[PDB]
Design a protein around this ligand. Structure first.
Ligand SMILES: [Zn+2]
Ligand SMILES: [Zn+2]
Ligand SMILES: [Zn+2]
Lengths: 96, 97
């Protein structure tokens, strides 16, 4: 399977806190299959609220725009919360 | 991010052909989140039909018996086909507690 890299950095609201502890980005790998290797699936760069007391979830959903093929995956991210959800509504590998 | 390894070896009815070409097993893997880091989720070992011209899917499903947490992944495996579906019907990490 293929990996997608997700970059998460602080919202402006939490940037001072994140810089104070010295923790200014998270990088998360998300795995998916060949179905979803397509040009429209690009590595996301997200903004979320840094909080050294919390653990948030990054969720990435894939859905084909022609067929009914879909996939959902989610991973924990230490110290970031209110991570926006990622959606790839694309033409799948096969449908292309 | 936890790797789950899946070992696939030939059924009795296909093992001779697999030995003939010297391809005795496939080791594949999928990934799952912290939700499914529980004792009853363990690397499976499966028997499937060796076939020299096919590519099969192995599917791995997770579902909690207490809440409705669930997860489905799959991976392609060269030369093995009719791979048994793997099902982890378990108590998830949130429901353990
Ligand atoms: Zn499609
Ligand atoms: Zn689903
Ligand atoms: Zn549960």
């Amino acid at each position: 399977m293929t990996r997608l890299e997700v970059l998460i950095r602080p919202t402006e609201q939490t940037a001072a806190k994140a810089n104070a502890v010295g923790y200014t980005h998270a990088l998360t790998w998300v795995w998916h299959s060949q179905t979803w290797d397509v040009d429209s699936v690009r590595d996301p760069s997200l903004r979320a609220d840094f909080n050294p007391e919390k653990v948030g979830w990054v969720s990435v959903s894939f859905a084909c725009t022609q067929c009914t093929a879909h996939y959902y995956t989610s991973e924990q991210v230490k110290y970031f919360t209110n991570i926006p959800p990622v959606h790839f509504d694309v033409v799948c590998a096969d449908c292309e």
